[PDB]
Amino acid sequence: AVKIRLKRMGAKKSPFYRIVVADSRSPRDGRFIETVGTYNPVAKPAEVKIDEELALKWLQTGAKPSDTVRNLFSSQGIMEKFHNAKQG
Amino acid sequence: MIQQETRLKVADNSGAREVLTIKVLGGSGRKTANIGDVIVCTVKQATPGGVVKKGEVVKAVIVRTKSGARRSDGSYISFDENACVIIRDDKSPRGTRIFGPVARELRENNFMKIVSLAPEVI
Amino acid sequence: SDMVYVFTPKGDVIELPSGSVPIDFSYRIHSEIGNKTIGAKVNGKMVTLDHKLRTGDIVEILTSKHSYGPSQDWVKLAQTSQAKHK
Amino acid sequence: SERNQRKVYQGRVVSDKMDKTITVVVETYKKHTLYGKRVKYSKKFKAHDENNQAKIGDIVKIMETRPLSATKRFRLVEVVEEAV
Amino acid sequence: IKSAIKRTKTNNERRVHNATIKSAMRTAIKQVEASVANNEADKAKTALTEAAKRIDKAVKTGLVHKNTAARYKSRLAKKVNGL
RNA sequence: UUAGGAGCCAGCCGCCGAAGGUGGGACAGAUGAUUGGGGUGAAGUCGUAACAAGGUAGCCGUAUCGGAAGGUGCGGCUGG
RNA sequence: GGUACCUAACCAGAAAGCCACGGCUAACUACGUGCCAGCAGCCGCGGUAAUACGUAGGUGGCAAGCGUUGUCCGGAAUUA
RNA sequence: GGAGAGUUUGAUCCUGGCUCAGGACGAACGCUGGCGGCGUGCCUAAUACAUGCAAGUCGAGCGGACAGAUGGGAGCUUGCUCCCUGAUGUUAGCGGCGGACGGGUGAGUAACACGUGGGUAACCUGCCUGUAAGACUGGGAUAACUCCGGGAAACCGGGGCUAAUACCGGAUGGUUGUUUGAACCGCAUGGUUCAAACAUAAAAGGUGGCUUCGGCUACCACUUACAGAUGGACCCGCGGCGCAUUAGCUAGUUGGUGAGGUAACGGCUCACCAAGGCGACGAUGCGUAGCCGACCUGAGAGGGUGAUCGGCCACACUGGGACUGAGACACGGCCCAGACUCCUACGGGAGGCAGCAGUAGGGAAUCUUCCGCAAUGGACGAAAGUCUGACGGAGCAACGCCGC
Question: Which nt sits closest to E24, CA to C1'?
């Protein structure tokens, strides 16, 4: 139930996203516990900024993200550092 | 067997609670009225929400009484409260619903909208 | 052309002057239709009483049986003056 | 690994007629959020006396716990000072 | 109404079955308590095992929710301790 | 082992139990003939009570009488 | 959603109003008008020369809005 | 980071009123109005609602139906008709989990509802990880299926057939309870740890591969235990209103003991016994109103408001109860009554828009009966997928700000 996930922000046409550790029972704009950095889809270049260390503490407690959120962690190697900890 | 100066429990949510009689619309002088006869009445009590309120000369139809009703079978219908249902001086009522049972000796005349609104035509 | 040729729930051409709301659609048929009208339906959808009819439309009427009645809001919901004189 | 300390006060006792329990008046006092002067209130509770060693006008401490009955949410600690 | 009719068709069928577990659990306790008004301990010992047979299987099935059943155990158990 | 017991349920029973009915009080609002003052308006009628020693120095409190402002009685006050 | 967008081609062509104008308060004259018609948030304007009414010209205000309206705060140190 | 101005008067100063310039609206109205972003858009009626949609999902839980033709064979008209169970396809019902969240409205509620800080040795937590263990042996049904019966329908009843990760016993288990020991510590209840004894307490298979056909294996699910993660319940100080032309108010009230009851503390319930408790720091009462981060305004101190967006409580036509489920007293679930609507062959039933739209009605006054699951989200499933009026956008009105 505890899904680390995106959070919809910004204007009407061009969205913005914040990567958020929360409960799924709260709504799409619902409350949370603690966040990690950002996401930008409307940039044709990069600038997806992640704290890159804080979620690994939450992943050791166990919080399954959706894959659209998860592959950003693969792009910065959070999960592979975490999989090394699971191989540790 | 309803006379002059009797008090009747009213069987619709048209405004009234208790109704007293004047005269049975028979001939020169008719004493009683069993079922289906038409009385000119007045209103001794009404609901606070009232279309027809306190002190109104009304014309009404007996529905259910503590009288017999000799069918040709020999079956005698006899309720346990004298009553009326207030009508709009015609062969048609003016209330919305009709509380409680209704005697089947109203179908001898054409009061069928009271029959169609009755919940249990006994 | 100063008149609307609208259709009844049979499909008969109802010749009324132009600019009519469906309240004006009632009184050509019968006056008590206006006494018992609640809503209206033109071509599948309900239409508001704020709608003004056009020439060549099928107008169905949501009519109460004998239960309901008018208000003060309808006195300027009569565009056509001959129906407004009704 | 000590657990969290509970609510605690000291105060002064009005009456003793309650069975194995009393009332204790707390006299902390504060300023007002508009003017500034500091006036005193009356704060009284219901406190458990397991030994019934209570006096009218007794200086004593109270200690909260799980609520023992209707409105009783305190037990004593130490009978500090007694009346005359 | 929104195709949740399947709930009520099962909820009543479970309501019969659950109460048979619940009411037999009630009769097991009183029969132990029958051996408290009676002055029999050996009959109370085999009834306590007979009662706790239903009690321990009860939370295994559904809502009896052990923290009640611990009070159901010990209140019966002190009476056998009382004999 | 050809069925009894256990347990179970239909059923009825008891306490609790909403709405309904009955009854005398509470308060809230419309309404009620007539009346009681209170202001508010065009040169209405009646007096002149105040403000000058206002033509009897005013004024507060109480009492009392008259078309009505007021009158005087008694005490008090200077803003006589 | 071929929507944003960009590329090229076309024309002064498509397109401004309401409010104020004695003093508060920036801005005034001419006709009409004669306690009447009418303005008015404030002081108050008109019984024949109305910068205050209504109109016209001309200013001024602000602008895809402008006035009026009801609200709440402020100015109101006028609950301090 | 703090402007004042007209007015009592014949004239002056004070005094004191109101008036005025300013700033906001979820604002409406009058007149006009070209466009583009971004944002709001029933406050009155929590008044009644036509129509469509707003919560389902698993054939890899399961029986059967249901098509199917891989081929096999049959009768011949060469047009077909089949009989076997192909790949695979469909899912009424069954069973698993969700429906308690997502979403709306602001009616009650002046109190631990909320805001803040606390406490729990007085509690709970399916779905999440991680660890510890495991997953033995049987049993009886029953829907669907049909076969009759009764019904206008709503549907209901009876007789057989059958399944499962459905249900129910037997074993073994470090749960828990009892009994008796120890150790340590707190804040009284005590708490924590260790031993022994007794008492019971489970589980389930499915998917694919490998097979010696015994099975094995991963993966999913399952029972139990530990923690963590996770939300929830209960208690407590301290806060934010109006009236004294509301001064007395309460007997389960307030106390104790025991009992029952609740996940849990308790007059929470009941017996008994006691007479207390609440109060001029304003009880009780009454009118009033959802609260808060915040919004607006002010120079600040303060004052007003509590719309949208975000937190939480409360409510789901009005009222009361209750089940299954980790979690409700359940917004689109059941049962009952009250009003009302609809149908009936009068015997009977079905219904709940303050879900999205839209309409009625109210009122000065508030919008489109669109498209899409592409992104975000949830729901279930091993996944594809399915389902989504959450949301995504389009549409309306100068409603407001900014931009041309």
Answer: F7
Classify residue B41 by burial, with Cβ atoms within 10 Å: 0-12, 13-18, 19+: buried
Strand H-proximal residues of E, range 15-54, CB below 7 A, are 15, 17-19, 21-22, 48-49, 52-53
Q: Which two tokens stand for residue C42?
A: 């033109």
Residue nearest to nucleotide H312 (CA to C1'): A31
Nucleotide nearest to A12 (CA to C1'): H38
Please write down the long-range contacts of D10-13, taking CB distance under 8 Å and 24 or more positions apart.
Answer: D10/D59, D10/D60, D10/D61, D10/D62, D10/D80, D11/D59, D11/D60, D11/D61, D11/D62, D12/D57, D12/D58, D12/D59, D12/D60, D13/D54, D13/D55, D13/D56, D13/D57, D13/D58, D13/D60
E23 touches strand F (CB under 7 A): yes
Going by their DSSP bridges, the two strands C13-17 and C37-42 should be labelled as: unpaired
**E12 beta carbon to strand F: under 7 Å:** no
In the Cβ-directed half-sphere of D49, how many Cα atoms lie within 13 Å?
21
SS (H, E, C) chain B: CCCCCCEEEECCCCCEEEEEEEEECCCCCCCCCCCCCEEEEEEEEECCCCCCCCCCCEEEEECCCCCCCECCCCCECCCCCCEEEEECCCCCECCCCCCCCECHHHCCCCCHHHHHCCCCEC
Distance (Å) from CA E75 to C1' H14?
Answer: 90
Handedness of CA B61, B63, B69, B71 (dihedral sign): positive
In angstroms, the CA A19 to CA A13 distance is 20
CA of A42 and C1' of H343: distance in angstroms? Answer: 57
Q: How far is the CA of C59 from the C1' of H59 (A)?
A: 50
Alpha-carbon gap, residue A69 to A21, rounded angstroms:
11
CB of E27 lies under 7 Å from some atom of strand F:
yes
Q: What CA–CA distance (Å, rounded) separates D24 from D49?
A: 11
| 8 A C-beta contact, residue C60 and residue C42 | yes
A47 CB below 7 A from strand H atoms: no
CA separation for the pair D61, D81 (Å, rounded): 10
Closest CA to A4 of A55, A57, A76, A77: A55
Quick check: A41 and A15 in contact, CB under 8 A? yes
d(CA E70, CA E1): 41
* Interatomic separation, CA of residue E71 and C1' of nucleotide H132, rounded (Å): 29
Q: CA-to-CA distance for D74 and D51, rounded, in angstroms?
A: 14
CA dist C39 and C47 (Å) reads 8
By the 8 A CB rule, do E31 and E37 touch? Answer: no
In 3-state terms, what secondary structure has residue D7? coil
Helices (H) and strands (E) counted in chain C, each on its own, are 3, 5
